[PDB]
Symmetry: D2
């Protein structure tokens, strides 16, 4: 049912668990914000799957062969041809990570006053869109905002919402469609190939461009192979290649499905757009032949992207996350369903029924999880959404969750059992979790550096 | 009951993951001899725990700081102070691995005609003793020769057997006592501290030297902390240091409990013998400051020896092997008991009761294990026993076993489940396992290059 | 006169060593543009000293100990304490390289309509200043614009020019003073400590902030120790620490004097500005605890910054460049004087007097240098100057040069002889060097992808 | 005349020079024996070219891909096919270093009472020969024992001495001919292909086997390409392959011309001899599939052997040594001529004319070189030869030299200038070097651990 690791351990990293009394003082030192905890004080660090992956022996062999030249590096050509072969795009510009590519795309394809629509948003992607004068519109299906609803391909774009946007606003006022695979905020939920084919069908008829947020496209491809009829005989590589044939470009964070600790890139097919991207990348990232990355990192990212296409690797990656989610569900712990490809999301509304959203249950639950287990998790609720135009009123999203994000090839099933057993025991006395109050809030992006205090 | 890994994965090693029908063709190409399989064709390689360990990030950092000087390397001095601090011996000479140190010890401490006694033997250790003119005498307790007998500290030396040897032959005719921790041939069985203190008491009264075969002393130290009363408050380091306080020297294979892939050393307290050891090491290994080792390897062994002292590491190491043994026992699979610190031994005679020892049941069971799971194990029965060269007849041992030897920090519990589930599945249909016949047998060391075919 | 390397070679990098007739075919394939050569076809790559450095064994040991956590990495804290100890600034935000830090500084410290003044400019620094609405004013001393003038500390700011700006425009209309050490565009010319103290004296009296472009501050510190009276007893570290005591912050490119292949950071003393910097870094680079960098790269930069403080290292670095300049000057080759800390600039106008600037003598000389020696150099003349987009006419700079930029710890004196002997041999028959004509010119950034053919 | 390094520096190792007053105390602490100095106290360590080489980026990439399996490692198969391809031998057995292979060969091919003849000897090779009951006979040409005689191919075997040995002793009493390439004790002197062809011609006519000591065969191949008529058009690989076609086997120390820090192997063509070697290697070294080496070290040795065949690499290696020798000769310093492939030998008899061989001028000169320059060198004189059968009488060889041994790819020409300038200045007051007296002498192999005191 759950496969063993399709690899061996080459090298290990020592870990240690500090006692509860010290975890409590660390949590108070961090202002009850898991973002402010020190890495050395964490047993199992499930804060994010971004850049926290373990590399292979092949990737580390490439690390010893870094061609650090400013132009014409062999590492760049290797990364270039690999992406052209696997993704099928004509041009590629490397960037130091995903939000570097998003900065380039938002300045190239957005006119002040236009609309950008997509299946939910991400914080950095939406910021660069809004900074360049766009208004974001969520066109994901309504069921994606309901945590407990267990349906397949929750991340699909609602075609009726997309049709309604084109009719009310016009096609000329739409910059592009931003299709994310997978959808991070909905719980790592996949998008079906039929939805990608249908979106491409409707947008091309109105001359609207489609750009993918491809950070977790490999996990998305596995869900297509597993659950969409007609793709069970297709390889992961074939599905990934067909996915991108419905996009005019993409922004990629190699720190996710490329199995590296740093790196990203921007892809496109248009020649004029690629020429403008090279003029903008030298301002923010670097030369088009390295783009803010060391040669050895372009090499590791090229090798890692090819390793991710192995069916056994991605099957184990996804089913390890599913294993953690199944143990939590079997004990009655409320989670977002279905389990996504990279994380399990605890439903803090049901976990902390005795608390209101104004008491920040997700931020308080993440603090209690660390103090009780030594596991770091990320708040994904009201604090990440922010406040807008009303003086002091928070955004209220339906999803008030705590994210247990699994780095790739770093932890074992026994580590998943430690996480599950500690959360299940915490769920027994969930009424003890206390509310939080803002003692410091930045002007923007409060989730990263805000400090709180108990109620 | 079974702890999770007290570390996370830093880097992984790629494996093939070939299907069963291809593993069958690989096994036929190897003549149904697991010793002839190529490493690249193996999922889980349980052939040996020697030199197959995974190193830590700290060790690989030391690998980058290799002082490769021919004499006076900083890496040697680091290894020297580490062993002097942890083992308590005065002098140390590095060797490329354990049998290099045994070659030196046998030439230094044995006069032609003397006797060497010890708690059973190992192949290379007994050869160097006999090569230099010694006669080996087994003084282990009788209970060590009972495979199914589940008692603690099976590797203890029988004090009455040792007393009888001293009286009949004399103390001047005894070269030394060779005390192995643990006892590999008995199944990795530990020796009690009380037995070590008693041997030191008896030999010192007759002027007899005691040298340890300390290859797996860390695993032995854990058994003392776990099962011997009075040591439950002692750290692993304190137990190890007290163990060697009853010996005049030791031979160590770092490829086991020092958590490296190559290396060993020879320790002693006598100054004159250390002076002769330095003259002999330059003939066979190298300078006393590197002894057949690269500088970076002395550094990794010094770092690894200190990492082995962590209680959580060695507890998990031993309980990971115990997990495999308990799962096999709970399903009714016959194993050697009790489970040792480094391996589980399947009883192939009881596993393949429908086959005779002339049909090589252990060799045939090892072949089936690979084909069904991709797991390589080692035959330890009539094939590895060899032939008597005078009569031409096989040596026939009471132990017809298959050894599942677990490298340190390489595999997870999920890998142990792969091994267990496939063997349990084989045991349910064990009547289908067929005998083997020699199609090629070399003159000597037939275990390594013999080829077979089904009967 | 010229010291030997204060280090030995730990590991080497393979090179092709292709003959002259093949280098000619490579140059023709590259359209006679050294920017289009492949790295694998280059023996000595003097294109830039940015990110091309060789690291030490200590740095590579740190590469194995990367803490890749998203927040609170131990590598960040190590980098933080190192910069606070060596530079003396209160706060630090890491960036993926120098132009990432410049993007942050320009958005934080510039109000639309204000002025920025500095000792000449750099391309990326001036862009981010002008992008945020500033007007750049050159306040360097007039002597910096004389190529052949051999005087010390050519990069000093003219205090009278700075005083005139404050009086005519007002202090409230001045964003900050951008003091670069060293001054790249003037040829890597250093700034005196007395000039730094005087600028801090004048700006502090008017409430004006001073930010350093500290990319090559270590090379600058050596010039102070070597040529400025009163600092001959001071260590490199003491001089560096005193330099930054006259600044309110700095932007650093670790790819230069931090002896790494990627990395940078932003420093400042003000608490409120540091609070705003943490909100802005998560948009463009990443979390304030990694800032677009892998953990291992923050570790290598922390180790490399401390290695750069060794007097013997920086003395050899600078005198290796001086050796190349002295050998060219002793043979009569026209170079920019005095020789800077990181590169030698050939005067291509005097080298190719028989050619006009419309025939691209610097671009043609760089092509001949590669074909004759396998050395890549960078054109810094009319081609890299660009075209005015309104008129369509080339920008015509007084400096028509070829830059021989020396990476740190990569090449030896024998490699410098290869460069010198081939250029001296070319200078003896310089009348044979032919002009070039555009066969392909891109719309922008023509230096990188233009292709030429002989005239 | 002298080529630059045909590689770039990938990573560096920090070095440091301790003052003279500390170098003096270190030399006294070492008993005036450079073998007892600590590596950290040495600026330029010219003690040996064995295992002190710098590896390439390709080799370090292979280090990350160590297949550490006990049998069937991919690293072993790579090393096996590389040696079969480059050396042309049928079988190969890996060993941890050269003297491990010599131990195997001496036990396989020597009967007690037989003679072994060769072009001079080495300490470990002659010991294993004499330990197994052989009597060594030097059959090198007489001119090899004259330090100042500058003739080509000084290491050739005298065919008349070989013919005389066969006639006086008989062919059945000759175990084999041990042909070393190059000849270490004569100054690294090459053997001509014509001499190898002639030796093979004479021995095959009497049924006598020939085994090569191939540790520095690549350096030998370069001398053949440079100085022997008819081989100037042949590649290094072709010459190496033809060299071994005149041998029945070889012993190799990879620590020399394979550009690694540890490793060796034994080659042969006979099937019965290879079968016996596998039985003996498991006793002393390990399995025939790893032979006392980690997988990653077999990989580095396989990659390094192929890199050594590059003409530019070996040309620079040899001419860098020649550069040091030419500077010493141009200043009047007495050296062994011609300069060998791996070291310059100072003639201590002419250097210390005022001292007798009983005062150990070579051992005293090596001590003075370190104290005055921080350079470590090796004594190669009376102390290395030993005493035999007379009670207290030393062996007296014509060569009383001090060896300046150059590791491969570690030092630069500027480092050679530091060595030369310090020795030339020492030669000005050579009358100050004092004699030495034995204060401690081991029973055997006194050169490594003897301690001395001034006269
Ligand atoms: C869908 C998606 N797009 C873009 C980014 C930004 O990419 P980057 O610049 O970090 O490489 C992220 C980052 N998500 C991370 C940070 C997370 O989920 O924790 C993401 O999840
Ligand atoms: C010709 C020759 N053969 C064999 C050996 C022994 O090989 P090893 O066991 O050291 O790999 C050496 C070692 N010479 C070294 C030690 C030297 O000249 O310093 C040697 O020079
Ligand atoms: C108890 C014991 N002593 C000595 C040795 C020899 O040490 P080297 O292997 O380091 O020379 C071994 C190795 N046992 C290995 C070979 C096994 O169990 O497969 C051993 O188990
Ligand atoms: C003085 C100076 N400031 C800022 C920068 C930009 O820093 P990053 O390159 O780290 O973004 C550079 C780089 N100069 C390089 C590009 C050269 O001289 O080729 C520089 O020389
Ligand atoms: K770089
Ligand atoms: K070495
Ligand atoms: K990271
Ligand atoms: K190994």
């Amino acid at each position: 049912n759950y496969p063993a690791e399709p690899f061996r351990i080459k090298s290990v990293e020592t870990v240690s668990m500090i006692p509860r009394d010290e975890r409590l003082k660390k949590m108070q030192e961090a202002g009850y914000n898991t973002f402010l905890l020190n890495s050395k004080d964490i047993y199992i660090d499930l804060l994010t799957d971004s850049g926290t992956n373990a590399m292979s022996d092949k990737q580390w062999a490439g690390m010893m062969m870094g061609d650090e030249a400013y132009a014409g590096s062999e590492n760049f050509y290797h990364l270039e041809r690999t992406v052209q072969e696997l993704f099928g795009f004509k041009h590629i510009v490397p960037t130091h990570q995903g939000r570097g590519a998003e900065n380039l795309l938002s300045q190239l394809a957005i006119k002040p006053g236009q609309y950008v629509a997509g299946n939910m948003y991400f914080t950095t992607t939406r910021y660069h869109q809004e900074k360049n004068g766009a208004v974001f519109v969520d066109i994901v299906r309504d069921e994606a905002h309901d945590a407990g609803l267990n349906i397949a391909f929750k991340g699909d774009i609602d075609l009726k919402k997309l049709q309604k946007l084109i009719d009310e606003k016009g096609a000329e006022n739409i910059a592009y469609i931003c299709l994310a695979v997978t959808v991070n905020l909905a719980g790592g939920q996949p998008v079906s190939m039929a939805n990608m084919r249908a979106v491409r069908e409707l947008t091309a008829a109105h001359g609207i461009k489609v750009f993918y947020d491809a950070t977790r496209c490999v996990e998305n491809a596995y869900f297509i192979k597993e659950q969409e009829q007609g793709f069970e005989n297709k390889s992961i590589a074939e599905i990934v290649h067909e996915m991108f044939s419905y996009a005019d470009g993409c922004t990629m964070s190699g720190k996710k499905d490329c199995l590296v600790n740093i790196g990203g890139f921007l892809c496109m097919n248009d020649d004029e757009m690629f020429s403008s991207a090279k003029e903008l990348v030298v301002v923010y990232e670097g030369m088009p032949s390295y783009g803010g990355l060391a040669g050895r990192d372009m090499e590791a990212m090229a090798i890692g992207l090819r390793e991710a296409m192995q069916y056994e690797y991605i099957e184990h990656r996804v089913k390890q996350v599913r294993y953690l989610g199944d143990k939590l569900k079997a004990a009655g712990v409320p989670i977002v369903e279905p389990v996504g490809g990279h994380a399990v999301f605890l439903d803090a509304r049901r976990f902390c029924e005795h608390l209101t959203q104004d008491e920040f249950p997700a931020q308080s639950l993440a603090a209690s999880i660390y103090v009780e287990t030594g596991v770091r998790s990320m708040e994904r609720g009201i604090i990440s959404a922010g406040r807008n135009n009303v003086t002091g009123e928070h955004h209220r999203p339906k999803l008030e969750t705590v994210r247990l994000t699994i780095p790739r090839r770093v932890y074992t099933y026994a580590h998943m059992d430690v996480v599950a057993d500690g959360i299940i025991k915490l769920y027994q006395h969930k009424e003890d979790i206390r509310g939080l109050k803002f003692i410091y809030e930045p002007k923007q992006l409060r989730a990263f550096t805000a400090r709180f205090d108990y109620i």
